[PDB]
Design a protein around this ligand. Sequence first.
Ligand SMILES: CC(C)CCC[C@@H](C)[C@H]1CC[C@H]2[C@@H]3CC=C4C[C@@H](OC(=O)CCC(=O)O)CC[C@]4(C)[C@H]3CC[C@]12C
Ligand SMILES: CC(C)CCC[C@@H](C)[C@H]1CC[C@H]2[C@@H]3CC=C4C[C@@H](OC(=O)CCC(=O)O)CC[C@]4(C)[C@H]3CC[C@]12C
Ligand SMILES: Nc1ncnc2c1ncn2[C@@H]1O[C@H](COP(=O)(O)OP(=O)(O)O)[C@@H](O)[C@H]1O
Ligand code: ALF
Ligand SMILES: [Mg+2]
Ligand SMILES: [Mg+2]
Length: 1036
Amino acid sequence: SVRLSGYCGSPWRVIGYHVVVWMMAGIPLLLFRWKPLWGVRLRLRPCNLAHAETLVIEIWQLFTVQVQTEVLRYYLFQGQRYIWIETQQAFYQVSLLDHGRSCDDVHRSRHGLSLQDQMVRKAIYGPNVISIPVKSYPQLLVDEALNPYYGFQAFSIALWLADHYYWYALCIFLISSISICLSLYKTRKQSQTLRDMVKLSMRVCVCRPGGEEEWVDSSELVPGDCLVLPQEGGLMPCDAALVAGECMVNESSLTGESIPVLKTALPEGLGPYCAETHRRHTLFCGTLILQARAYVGPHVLAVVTRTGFCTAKGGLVSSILHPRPINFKFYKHSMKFVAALSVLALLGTIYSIFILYRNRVPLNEIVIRALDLVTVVVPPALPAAMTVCTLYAQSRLRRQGIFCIHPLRINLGGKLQLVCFDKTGTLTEDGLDVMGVVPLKGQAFLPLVPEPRRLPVGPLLRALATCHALSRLQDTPVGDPMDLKMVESTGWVLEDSAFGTQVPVPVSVLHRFPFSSALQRMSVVVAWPGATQPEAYVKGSPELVAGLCNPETVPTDFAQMLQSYTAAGYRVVALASKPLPTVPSLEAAQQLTRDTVEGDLSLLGLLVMRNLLKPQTTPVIQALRRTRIRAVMVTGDNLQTAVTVARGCGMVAPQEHLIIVHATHPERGQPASLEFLPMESRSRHLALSGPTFGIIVKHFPKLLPKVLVQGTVFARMAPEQKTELVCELQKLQYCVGMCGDGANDCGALKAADVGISLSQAEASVVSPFTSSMASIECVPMVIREGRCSLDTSFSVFKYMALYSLTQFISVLILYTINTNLGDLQFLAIDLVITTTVAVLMSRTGPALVLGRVRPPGALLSVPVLSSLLLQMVLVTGVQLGGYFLTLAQPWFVPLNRTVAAPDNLPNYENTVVFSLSSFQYLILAAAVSKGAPFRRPLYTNVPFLVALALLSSVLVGLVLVPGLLQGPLALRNITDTGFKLLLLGLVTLNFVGAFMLESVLDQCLPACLRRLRPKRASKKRFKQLERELAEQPWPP
Ligand SMILES: CC(C)CCC[C@@H](C)[C@H]1CC[C@H]2[C@@H]3CC=C4C[C@@H](OC(=O)CCC(=O)O)CC[C@]4(C)[C@H]3CC[C@]12C
Ligand SMILES: CC(C)CCC[C@@H](C)[C@H]1CC[C@H]2[C@@H]3CC=C4C[C@@H](OC(=O)CCC(=O)O)CC[C@]4(C)[C@H]3CC[C@]12C
Ligand SMILES: Nc1ncnc2c1ncn2[C@@H]1O[C@H](COP(=O)(O)OP(=O)(O)O)[C@@H](O)[C@H]1O
Ligand code: ALF
Ligand SMILES: [Mg+2]
Ligand SMILES: [Mg+2]
């Protein structure tokens, strides 16, 4: 649901808003950007929608859109025009302006669009350009700089400059600049990807009315404008309908299917035009026209129906630009965790104020120093660390050959609990192998003919040779792999469309109804010289086609034979025919209605084909099942073939059970019924067809969750059924991933949390994730790298927390004795050590093998909190131990209490504390960087390892080598060498202790937690169902 809110312009209120929110404070701006409804209400008065000058959009999320004027006024929301419909006093999307006009209306527009009407319509529909705005670099800098985080960083810069800490201010500025530049790089790279995806600049001639023509730019097109297509072909600039002609088009960009598709002229009729119903008659935007020819007339004509963002390409681009929010929140209790850190920060700030009062510090300086302490705990480099983490993850995936359009989905990839796989072309090879054809002799099957070439010239051989959608492209047939192999098996050569016998008269294809996955069948109308009348051949699902055949033509053995070939793993389609009493000619034969042809056939035979499992499929499936990630197969193929492939690919290990759920339709006199018939060779899976799934969803919503939880093979699923299944699974709190290659999986890939399409280009739009490899190996890679990304982000957050608390502790310890860290010591710690380490942590790659244990989801969990508190206890212990150990030395000289830092620097206390803390930052970075089970070991990150080694060596030099940077850093020299070695020993003790503590926690904490407060259950619906089924299996 949506709603508008119009606010007519008023300058007095605007200036009042400006003065109030500028003079008062920035807090009103903060809460306005948090709650903008108040801001808009204050800025201007609600007004009549017709008089509206600004609109607020609720979908609640509030968006503000200016109502532009061009006599005609409109407004763009998410790239969608809405014009001012004067008669209805409302804003209707331009998508609906011409909607509903009949096919005959399109054929009337066929001739062209009047130039005056063209310019009248260009304003309404706008230029035919999917435009991704190209923001100027200053505009982007404004986009990022206005972040309140960078506002606080600028406040810190000012505060430190006021205190004469110039190097620290420079450090803050440099880190903020690095963060801003990394954000710029991220945004610019994403925008460049999209922009380069949706480039289009070409000149297309338009059949202007009156019979003449005109060469216009592709951006001048408007719905109803007439396209004349180039005979040799070219990129299609806008969605259109084929009024006249036939077109071969490559829809790979739009759907990822590289096989050329056949496009035909729109059929005249008094019914509404629809890009979905008439998809076969409509060219799409961004698809390549391989070659089109005109059956009648000098040139092929098409009529534009959708331009700009209205197009399907435009719809996908808009969905990318404004993605649906990710429902999962990766870092649970993030606010509560930052609050548990802020309580410590506030306690320390109060303690700092108390001590500074105790030391009799002037109130002008007490507030300044407490404010400085406040600025300490905000890490300048946190945004840079996060953005670098995401960039490294994306780069790793791209190097592996997997491209993600929304990098935020990478984290989701590691949270997958269920993966749905298309069977054909994803688990099994794209190619087929004709094992033979099973002809019929009356009402009984004959022995399999392994070589169809030897079939006598008759209905079956002509059906094999002719029932398909092949097209000769550059003297090479192209089309469905099944059609290619079927035709090749017969030896007939493609040359409407005619076929030449292998060596027996050539046969013409008068008319052809293409294959639709929803219909899961396909037919043609055929005639040859000497034919009394044309014959229509149908080729589709064996069980569906057998329904169209006359009951006396289908053998009583049909089910058993089809299962004999299907239960062996073959891919079977049936061929049926019926003589058409129409006179053989394109005139009548081209006017046939598909339904008139499909019904009342006469089964001819079964075409058995051998589709093989990909070599890489079984290892991947077994790896997925080893880590308790449910593997589900959603396919449109036969149920027995699907089950055999599942048993062969490890989705059903031999020991495990399998039960076929079969649902009977609610025929008259009885309701729908569920019957479970187990088939002999967690531990129990279910298999069910598509009609059975629909019956279960409609009539057994109570048992539907139990079917979904333990259902593994979903066969004979239509594309809408695949999308519905994905949605239903997601309703069980599953994190569903879908790995399908075909175009019939577009809906599932959109709906799935993680959608992967296998055979794609360097980049694409079809699905969130796209790969270049033909195997399903991308699924384990995506899951592994998503787990690595989650662990890396958690480790970076933990390190920044530890990094902050350590600096906080150091500064508190130094305040307690009336001194500070130092001008250049702050720079060193924040930039040379911490930024380097934080940006190098994330470069480490993912673990090579998936593991059963999932990455943690909560930042506030007892493990993480205990780790942080124990680490900080060790850090404070080490720093205070060093501080109290230096006081014990005979050569110790206490700092000058009276003068305050940086005046009292250098001194022994600051020197010792700085040395220990500087080592501790590297120690903590090494401690938090866990390798297993989600990442590679630390040492495989050669940049990060080298950074640690070099920084540690430099710090040891500072401690040991006299005079090294002891002036620039304001470090006091410690003549005693035994105490230097004692400081190094304390540092080594901390280095060992942090790692031992981390290991002890990560090993013995989960066991103690389980044995202490075991979880009664899990909020996940599917986990509840799993436990319930274990308690009581649903099928007895
Ligand atoms: C004062 C000194 C000691 C501070 C040193 C800081 C550097 C270690 C940091 C600052 C920003 C970091 C960069 C920020 C992010 C990236 C992006 C990354 O490159 C890509 O992601 C592109 C790959 C592709 O095309 O897919 C390489 C590392 C790099 C440049 C980082 C390398 C390390 C950098 C230069
Ligand atoms: C005070 C003086 C005497 C010492 C100053 C030391 C720093 C300037 C050095 C120590 C380690 C150096 C870092 C060591 C490793 C690298 C990795 C390098 O990036 C890569 O290695 C990416 C390579 C790839 O992607 O193939 C960026 C610079 C950086 C962080 C160096 C930046 C400068 C650092 C922090
Ligand atoms: N060119 C074609 N013409 C007619 N039917 C086909 C063709 N190719 C495949 N089929 C049939 O369509 C049905 C469903 O196809 P689809 O939805 O793509 O799933 P899959 O092809 O993976 O089995 C299959 O059972 C198959 O027999
Ligand atoms: F195997 Al499929 F749609 F390609 F079910
Ligand atoms: Mg497929
Ligand atoms: Mg198919």
